[PDB]
CSV table of C-alpha atoms in Angstrom, one decimal:
chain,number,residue,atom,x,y,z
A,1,UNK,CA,10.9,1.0,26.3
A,2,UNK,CA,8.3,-1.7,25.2
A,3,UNK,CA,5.3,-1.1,24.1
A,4,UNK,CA,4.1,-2.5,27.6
A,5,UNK,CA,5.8,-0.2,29.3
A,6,UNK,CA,5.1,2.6,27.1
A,7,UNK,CA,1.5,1.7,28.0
A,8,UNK,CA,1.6,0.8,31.6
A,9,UNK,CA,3.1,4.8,32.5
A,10,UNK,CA,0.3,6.2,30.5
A,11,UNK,CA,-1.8,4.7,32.4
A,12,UNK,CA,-0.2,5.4,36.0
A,13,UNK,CA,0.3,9.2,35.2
A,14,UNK,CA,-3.6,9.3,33.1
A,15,UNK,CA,-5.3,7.3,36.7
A,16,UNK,CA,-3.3,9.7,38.6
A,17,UNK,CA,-4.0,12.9,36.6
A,18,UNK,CA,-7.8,11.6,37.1
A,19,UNK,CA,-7.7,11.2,40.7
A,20,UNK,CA,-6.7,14.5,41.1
A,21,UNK,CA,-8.8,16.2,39.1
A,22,UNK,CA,-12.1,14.5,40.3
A,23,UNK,CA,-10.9,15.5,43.8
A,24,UNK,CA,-10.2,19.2,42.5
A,25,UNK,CA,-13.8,20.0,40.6
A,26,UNK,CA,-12.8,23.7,39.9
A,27,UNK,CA,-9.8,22.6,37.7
A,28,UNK,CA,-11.8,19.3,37.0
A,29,UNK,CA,-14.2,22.3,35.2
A,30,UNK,CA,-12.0,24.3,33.4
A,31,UNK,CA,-10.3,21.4,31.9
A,32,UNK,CA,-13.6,19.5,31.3
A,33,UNK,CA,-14.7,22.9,29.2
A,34,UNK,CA,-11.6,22.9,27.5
A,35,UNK,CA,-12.8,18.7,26.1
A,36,UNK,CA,-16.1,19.9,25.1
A,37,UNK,CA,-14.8,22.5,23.1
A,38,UNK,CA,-12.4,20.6,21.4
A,39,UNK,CA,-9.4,22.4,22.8
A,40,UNK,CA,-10.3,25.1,20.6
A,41,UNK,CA,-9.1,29.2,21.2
A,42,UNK,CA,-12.0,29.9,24.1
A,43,UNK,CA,-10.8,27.0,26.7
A,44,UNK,CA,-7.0,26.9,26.4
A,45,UNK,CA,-7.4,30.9,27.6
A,46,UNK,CA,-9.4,30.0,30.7
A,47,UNK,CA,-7.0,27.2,31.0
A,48,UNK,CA,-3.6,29.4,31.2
A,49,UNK,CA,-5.4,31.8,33.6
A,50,UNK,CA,-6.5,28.9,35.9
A,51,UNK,CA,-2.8,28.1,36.3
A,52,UNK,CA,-1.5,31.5,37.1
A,53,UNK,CA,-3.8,31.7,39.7
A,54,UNK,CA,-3.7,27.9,40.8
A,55,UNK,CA,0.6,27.6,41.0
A,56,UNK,CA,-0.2,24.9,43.1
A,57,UNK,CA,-2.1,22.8,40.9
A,58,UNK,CA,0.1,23.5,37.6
A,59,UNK,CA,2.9,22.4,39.4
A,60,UNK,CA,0.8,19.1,41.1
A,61,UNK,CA,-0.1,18.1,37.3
A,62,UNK,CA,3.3,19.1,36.3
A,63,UNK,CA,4.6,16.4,39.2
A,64,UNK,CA,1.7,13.9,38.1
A,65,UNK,CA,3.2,13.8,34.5
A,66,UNK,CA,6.7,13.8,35.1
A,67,UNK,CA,7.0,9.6,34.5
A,68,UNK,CA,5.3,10.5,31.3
A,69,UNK,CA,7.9,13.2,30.3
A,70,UNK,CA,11.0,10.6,31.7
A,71,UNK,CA,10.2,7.9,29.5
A,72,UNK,CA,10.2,9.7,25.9
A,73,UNK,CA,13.7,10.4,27.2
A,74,UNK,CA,14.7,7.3,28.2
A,75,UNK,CA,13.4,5.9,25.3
A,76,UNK,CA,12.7,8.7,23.2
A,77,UNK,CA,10.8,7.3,20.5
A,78,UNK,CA,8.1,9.7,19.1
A,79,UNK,CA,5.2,12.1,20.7
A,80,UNK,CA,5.0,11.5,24.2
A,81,UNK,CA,1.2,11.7,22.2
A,82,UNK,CA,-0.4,9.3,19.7
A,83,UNK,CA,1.2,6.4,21.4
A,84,UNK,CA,-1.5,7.2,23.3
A,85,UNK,CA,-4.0,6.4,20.9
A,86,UNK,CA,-4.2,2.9,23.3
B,1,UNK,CA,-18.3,12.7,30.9
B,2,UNK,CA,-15.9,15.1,33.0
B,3,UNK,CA,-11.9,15.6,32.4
B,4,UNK,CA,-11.6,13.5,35.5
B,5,UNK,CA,-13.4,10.6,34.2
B,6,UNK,CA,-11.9,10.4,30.6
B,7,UNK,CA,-8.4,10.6,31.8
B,8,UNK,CA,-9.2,7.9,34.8
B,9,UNK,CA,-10.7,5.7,31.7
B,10,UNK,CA,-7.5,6.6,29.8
B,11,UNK,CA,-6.1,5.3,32.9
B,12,UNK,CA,-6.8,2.0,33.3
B,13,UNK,CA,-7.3,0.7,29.6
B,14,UNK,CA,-3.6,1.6,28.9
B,15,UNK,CA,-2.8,-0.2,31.9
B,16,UNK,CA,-4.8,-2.6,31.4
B,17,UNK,CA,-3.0,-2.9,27.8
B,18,UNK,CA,0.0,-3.2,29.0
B,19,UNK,CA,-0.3,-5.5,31.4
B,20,UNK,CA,-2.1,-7.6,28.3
B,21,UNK,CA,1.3,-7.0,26.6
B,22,UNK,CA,3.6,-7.7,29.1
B,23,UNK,CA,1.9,-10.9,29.6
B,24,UNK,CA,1.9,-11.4,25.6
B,25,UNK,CA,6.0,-11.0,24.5
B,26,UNK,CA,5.2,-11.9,20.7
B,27,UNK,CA,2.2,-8.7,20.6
B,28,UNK,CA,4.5,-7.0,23.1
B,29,UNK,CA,7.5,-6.7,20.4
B,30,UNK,CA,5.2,-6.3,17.2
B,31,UNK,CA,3.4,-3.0,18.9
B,32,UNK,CA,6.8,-2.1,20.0
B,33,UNK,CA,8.0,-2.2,16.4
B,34,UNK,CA,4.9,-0.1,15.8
B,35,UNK,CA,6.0,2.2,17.9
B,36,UNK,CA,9.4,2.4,17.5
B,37,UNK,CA,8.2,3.4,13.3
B,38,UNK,CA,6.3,6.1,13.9
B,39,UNK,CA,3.3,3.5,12.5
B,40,UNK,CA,5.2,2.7,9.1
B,41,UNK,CA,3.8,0.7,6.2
B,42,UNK,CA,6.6,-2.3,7.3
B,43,UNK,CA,5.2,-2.4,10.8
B,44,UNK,CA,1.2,-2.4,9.9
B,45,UNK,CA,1.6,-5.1,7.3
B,46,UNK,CA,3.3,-7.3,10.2
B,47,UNK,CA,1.0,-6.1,12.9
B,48,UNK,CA,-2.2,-7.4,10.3
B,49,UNK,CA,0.2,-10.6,9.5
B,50,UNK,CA,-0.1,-10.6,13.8
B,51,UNK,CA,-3.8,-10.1,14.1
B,52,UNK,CA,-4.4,-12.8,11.1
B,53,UNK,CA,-2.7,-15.2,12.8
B,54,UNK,CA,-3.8,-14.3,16.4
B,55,UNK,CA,-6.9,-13.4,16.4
B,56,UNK,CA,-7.7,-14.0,20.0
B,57,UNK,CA,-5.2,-11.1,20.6
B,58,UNK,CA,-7.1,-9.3,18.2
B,59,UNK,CA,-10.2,-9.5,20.2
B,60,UNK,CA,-8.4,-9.6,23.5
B,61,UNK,CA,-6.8,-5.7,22.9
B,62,UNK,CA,-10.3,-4.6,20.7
B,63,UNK,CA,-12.6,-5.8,24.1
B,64,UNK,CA,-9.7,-3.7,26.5
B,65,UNK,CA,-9.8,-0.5,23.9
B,66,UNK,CA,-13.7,-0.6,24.6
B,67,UNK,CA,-14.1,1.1,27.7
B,68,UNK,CA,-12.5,4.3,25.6
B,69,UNK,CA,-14.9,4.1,23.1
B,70,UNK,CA,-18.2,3.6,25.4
B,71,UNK,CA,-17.0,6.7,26.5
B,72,UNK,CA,-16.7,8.6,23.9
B,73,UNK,CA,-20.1,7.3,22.3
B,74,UNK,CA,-21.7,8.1,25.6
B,75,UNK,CA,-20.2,11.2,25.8
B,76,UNK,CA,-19.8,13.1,22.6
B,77,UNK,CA,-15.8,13.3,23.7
B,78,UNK,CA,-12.3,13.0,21.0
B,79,UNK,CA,-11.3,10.4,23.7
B,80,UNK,CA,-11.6,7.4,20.6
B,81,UNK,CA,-9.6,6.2,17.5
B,82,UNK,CA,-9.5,9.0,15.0
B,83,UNK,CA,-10.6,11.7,17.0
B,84,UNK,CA,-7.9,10.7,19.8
B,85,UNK,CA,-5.2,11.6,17.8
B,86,UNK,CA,-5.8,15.6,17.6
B,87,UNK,CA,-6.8,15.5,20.9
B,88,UNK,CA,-3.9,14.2,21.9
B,89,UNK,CA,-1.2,16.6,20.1
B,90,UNK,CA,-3.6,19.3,21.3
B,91,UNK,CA,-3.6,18.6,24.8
B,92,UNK,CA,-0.3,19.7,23.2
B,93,UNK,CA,0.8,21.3,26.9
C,1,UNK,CA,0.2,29.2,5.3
C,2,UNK,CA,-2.7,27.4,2.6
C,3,UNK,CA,-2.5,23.8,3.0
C,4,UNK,CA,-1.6,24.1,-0.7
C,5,UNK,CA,1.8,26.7,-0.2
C,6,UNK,CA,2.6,24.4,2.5
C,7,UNK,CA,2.5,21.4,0.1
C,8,UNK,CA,4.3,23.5,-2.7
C,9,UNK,CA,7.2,24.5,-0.5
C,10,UNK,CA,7.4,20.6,1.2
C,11,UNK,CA,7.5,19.8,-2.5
C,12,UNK,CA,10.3,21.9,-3.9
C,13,UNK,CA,12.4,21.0,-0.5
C,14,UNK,CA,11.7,17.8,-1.3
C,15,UNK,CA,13.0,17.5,-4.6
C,16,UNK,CA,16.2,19.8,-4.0
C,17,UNK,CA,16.8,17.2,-1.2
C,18,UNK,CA,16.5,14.4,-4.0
C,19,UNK,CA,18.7,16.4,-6.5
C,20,UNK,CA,21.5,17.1,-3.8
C,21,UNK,CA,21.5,13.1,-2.3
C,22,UNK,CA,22.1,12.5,-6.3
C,23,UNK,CA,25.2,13.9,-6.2
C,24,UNK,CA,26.2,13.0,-3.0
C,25,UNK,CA,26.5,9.0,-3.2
C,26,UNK,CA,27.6,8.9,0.1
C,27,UNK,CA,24.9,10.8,2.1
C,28,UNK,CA,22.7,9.0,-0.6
C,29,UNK,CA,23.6,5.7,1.2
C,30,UNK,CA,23.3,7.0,4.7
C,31,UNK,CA,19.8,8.5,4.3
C,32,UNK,CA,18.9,4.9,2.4
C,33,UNK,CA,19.9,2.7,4.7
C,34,UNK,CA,17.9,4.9,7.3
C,35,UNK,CA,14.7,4.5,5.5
C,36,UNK,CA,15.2,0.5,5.1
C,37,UNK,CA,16.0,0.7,8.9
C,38,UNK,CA,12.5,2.2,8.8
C,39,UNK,CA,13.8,4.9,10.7
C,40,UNK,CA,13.8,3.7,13.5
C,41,UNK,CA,17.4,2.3,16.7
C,42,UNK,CA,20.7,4.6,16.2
C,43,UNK,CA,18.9,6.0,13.1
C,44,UNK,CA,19.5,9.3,14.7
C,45,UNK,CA,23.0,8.3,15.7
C,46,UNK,CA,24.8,7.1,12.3
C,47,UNK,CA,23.4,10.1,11.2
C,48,UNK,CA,25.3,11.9,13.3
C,49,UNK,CA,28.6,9.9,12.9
C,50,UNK,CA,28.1,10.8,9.4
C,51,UNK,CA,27.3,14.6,10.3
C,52,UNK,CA,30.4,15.3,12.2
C,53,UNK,CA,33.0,13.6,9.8
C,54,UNK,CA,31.0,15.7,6.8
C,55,UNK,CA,30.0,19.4,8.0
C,56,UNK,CA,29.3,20.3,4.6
C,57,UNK,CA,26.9,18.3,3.7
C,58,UNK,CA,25.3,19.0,7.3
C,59,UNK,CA,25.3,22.3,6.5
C,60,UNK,CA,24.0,22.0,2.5
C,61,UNK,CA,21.0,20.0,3.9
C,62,UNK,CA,19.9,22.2,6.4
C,63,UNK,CA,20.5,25.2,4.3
C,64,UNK,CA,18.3,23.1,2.0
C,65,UNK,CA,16.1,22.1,4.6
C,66,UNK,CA,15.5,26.5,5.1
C,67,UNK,CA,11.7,27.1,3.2
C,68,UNK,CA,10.7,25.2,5.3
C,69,UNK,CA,11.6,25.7,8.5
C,70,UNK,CA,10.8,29.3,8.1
C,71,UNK,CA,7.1,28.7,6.8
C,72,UNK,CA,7.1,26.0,9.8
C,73,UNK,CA,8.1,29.6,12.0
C,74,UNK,CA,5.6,31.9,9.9
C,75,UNK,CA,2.5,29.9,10.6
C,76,UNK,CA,2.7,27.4,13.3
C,77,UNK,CA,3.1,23.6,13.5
C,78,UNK,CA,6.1,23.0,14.7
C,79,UNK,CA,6.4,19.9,12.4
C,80,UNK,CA,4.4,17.6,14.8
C,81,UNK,CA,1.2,18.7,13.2
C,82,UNK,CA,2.3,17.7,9.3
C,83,UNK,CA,3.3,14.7,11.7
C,84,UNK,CA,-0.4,14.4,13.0
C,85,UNK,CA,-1.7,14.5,9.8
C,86,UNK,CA,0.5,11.9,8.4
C,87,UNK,CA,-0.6,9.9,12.1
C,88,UNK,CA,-4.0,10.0,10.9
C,89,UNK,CA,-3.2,8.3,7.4
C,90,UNK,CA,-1.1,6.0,8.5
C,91,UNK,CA,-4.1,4.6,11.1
C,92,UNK,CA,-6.8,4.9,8.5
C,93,UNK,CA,-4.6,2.7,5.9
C,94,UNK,CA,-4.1,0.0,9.3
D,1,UNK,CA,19.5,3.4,-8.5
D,2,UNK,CA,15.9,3.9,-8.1
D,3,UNK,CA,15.4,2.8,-4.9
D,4,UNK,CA,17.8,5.5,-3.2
D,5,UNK,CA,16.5,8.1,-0.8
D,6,UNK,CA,17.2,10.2,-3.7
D,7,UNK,CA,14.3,8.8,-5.3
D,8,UNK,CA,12.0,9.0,-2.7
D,9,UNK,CA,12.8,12.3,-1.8
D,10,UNK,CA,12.4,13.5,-5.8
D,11,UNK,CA,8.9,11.2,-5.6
D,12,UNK,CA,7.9,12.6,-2.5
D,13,UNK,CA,8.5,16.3,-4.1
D,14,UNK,CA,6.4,15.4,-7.2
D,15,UNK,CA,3.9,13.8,-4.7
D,16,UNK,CA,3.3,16.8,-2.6
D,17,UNK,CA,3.5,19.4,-5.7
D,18,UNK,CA,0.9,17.7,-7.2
D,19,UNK,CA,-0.8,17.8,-4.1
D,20,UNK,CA,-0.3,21.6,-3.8
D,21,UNK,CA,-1.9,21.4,-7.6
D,22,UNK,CA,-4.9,19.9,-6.5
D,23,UNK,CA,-5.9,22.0,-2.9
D,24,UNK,CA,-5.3,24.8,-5.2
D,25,UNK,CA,-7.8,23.5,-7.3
D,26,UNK,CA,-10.0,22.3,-5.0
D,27,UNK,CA,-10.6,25.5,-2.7
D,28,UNK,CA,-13.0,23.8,0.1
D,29,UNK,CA,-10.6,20.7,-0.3
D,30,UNK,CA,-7.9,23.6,0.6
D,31,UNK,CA,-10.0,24.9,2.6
D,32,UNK,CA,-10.8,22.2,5.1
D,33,UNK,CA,-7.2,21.5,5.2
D,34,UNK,CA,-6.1,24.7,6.1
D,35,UNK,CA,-8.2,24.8,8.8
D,36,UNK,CA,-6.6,21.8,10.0
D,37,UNK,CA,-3.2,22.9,9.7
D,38,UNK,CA,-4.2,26.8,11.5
D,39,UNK,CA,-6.3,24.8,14.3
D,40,UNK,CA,-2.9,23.1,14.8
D,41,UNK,CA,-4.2,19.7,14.3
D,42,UNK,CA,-7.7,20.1,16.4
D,43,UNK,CA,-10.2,17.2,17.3
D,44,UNK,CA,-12.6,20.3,15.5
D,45,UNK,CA,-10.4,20.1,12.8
D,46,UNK,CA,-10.5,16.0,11.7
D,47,UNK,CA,-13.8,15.9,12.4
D,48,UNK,CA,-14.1,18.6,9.5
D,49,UNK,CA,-11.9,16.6,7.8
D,50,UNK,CA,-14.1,13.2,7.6
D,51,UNK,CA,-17.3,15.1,6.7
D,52,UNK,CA,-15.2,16.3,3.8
D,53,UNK,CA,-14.5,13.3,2.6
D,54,UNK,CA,-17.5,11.6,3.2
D,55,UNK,CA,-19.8,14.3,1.5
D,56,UNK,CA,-17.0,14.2,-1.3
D,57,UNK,CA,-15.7,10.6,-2.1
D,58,UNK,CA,-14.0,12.1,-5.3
D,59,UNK,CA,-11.4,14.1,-2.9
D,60,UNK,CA,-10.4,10.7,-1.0
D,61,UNK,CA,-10.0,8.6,-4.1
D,62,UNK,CA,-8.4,11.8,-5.6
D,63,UNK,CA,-5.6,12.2,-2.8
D,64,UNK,CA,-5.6,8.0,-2.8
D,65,UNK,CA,-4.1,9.0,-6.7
D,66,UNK,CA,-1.9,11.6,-5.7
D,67,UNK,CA,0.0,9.4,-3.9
D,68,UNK,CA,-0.1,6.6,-6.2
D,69,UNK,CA,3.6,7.1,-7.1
D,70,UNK,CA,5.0,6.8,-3.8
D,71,UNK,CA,3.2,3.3,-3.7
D,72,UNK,CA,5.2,2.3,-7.2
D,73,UNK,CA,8.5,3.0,-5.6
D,74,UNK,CA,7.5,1.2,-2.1
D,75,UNK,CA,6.4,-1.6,-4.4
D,76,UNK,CA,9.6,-1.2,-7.3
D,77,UNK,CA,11.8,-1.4,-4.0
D,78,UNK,CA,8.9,-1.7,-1.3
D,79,UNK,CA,10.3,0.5,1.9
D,80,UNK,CA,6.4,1.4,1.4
D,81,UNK,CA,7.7,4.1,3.7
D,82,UNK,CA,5.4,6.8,3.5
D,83,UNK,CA,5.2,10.8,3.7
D,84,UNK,CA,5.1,10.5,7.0
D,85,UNK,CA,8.4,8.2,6.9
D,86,UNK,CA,9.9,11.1,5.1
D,87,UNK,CA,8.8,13.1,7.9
D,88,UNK,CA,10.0,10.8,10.4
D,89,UNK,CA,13.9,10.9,8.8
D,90,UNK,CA,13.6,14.9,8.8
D,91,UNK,CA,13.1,15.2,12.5
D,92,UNK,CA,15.9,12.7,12.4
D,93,UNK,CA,18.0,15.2,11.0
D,94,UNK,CA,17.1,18.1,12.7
D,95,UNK,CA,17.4,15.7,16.2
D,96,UNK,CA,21.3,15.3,15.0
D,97,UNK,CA,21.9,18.7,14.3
């Protein structure tokens, strides 16, 4: 529950999450378009629609971040988020 | 500057990170203090105290966080320091 | 949901939190030694040692606690975004 | 005493009252930080929020007075635990319940 191991699955899940999006371009799109426009209102509802039509890949990402979701259980310490600031 | 590409850079400088503080138990327990305090005025003043008296750790974790702000310099991205931390709750789920 | 109405309504919970720990030396204690723990280990779980052997004062603080929660439900936020905020100070002052 | 979460819960109340004075009074200051809060925290958002205070130095030594007092107390007992602290112990509580 270290900070070194807080770091280390953010970075497995993050590298993996990358992997597969550079290997899926359509989804690598949407959520690219959803970054340039700074997650605002447009995005996120292109977003939700890719993944009722992609079940597949929302439950692939879903799989990818599972470690990520574990740990702030095991450990439980504050947003499974800004930790990521590193 | 694609989604792929910034989380692949997320990717390996918080691995590369941890590693660094695996390797570095004194850092390791002051960032896990840090942590562990939601980023508390106790836990900054002994993180500085840390740097102060470190600073090749300093400059170690600065050069690892680089990669993540190259990007986001080259790419007009969140992805850094202040801007991270939006983007972050945001890609909220 | 103004910034300022959320401020307004953190501050009177706030303060009728402060007025309540006053006269409850007890729960004053708890909630102190908390904060000097910096919040952080079985911070959560004295609390709740202290929560099931005193229901009442459970129940006084969340009734307390009530403003807002429901302005957190009639706007959005879910508290992580107050949290964000307060994320964004705390790396500015480091 | 003074140095009971009593006290920083009253000083945290005058804190953020005061605060509530001052976005009232300072509509583009309110404004911006609306924004912030109803764009849930956006990168959009923060980035609205520096330009503020860079074009308007006044507002961040302003809120840098505003929560002077909590400072006093951190520094009368020094928890220097901050808003966010008091945050922090809330979702505490609600976690227990």
């Amino acid at each position: 529950c270290a900070a070194s191991e807080v770091a280390r699955t953010v970075g497995s899940v993050a590298k993996s999450m990358g992997d597969y999006l550079d290997s899926h371009p359509e989804t690598n799109q949407v959520m690219t378009a959803v970054l340039q426009q700074q997650v605002g209102p447009g995005s996120v509802a292109s977003l939700k629609a890719h993944f009722e039509a992609n079940p597949k890949v929302a439950s692939d990402l879903h799989a990818l971040s599972q470690p990520l979701t574990d740990l702030s259980t095991r450990c439980s310490l504050p947003i499974s988020g800004l930790q990521a600031i590193g």
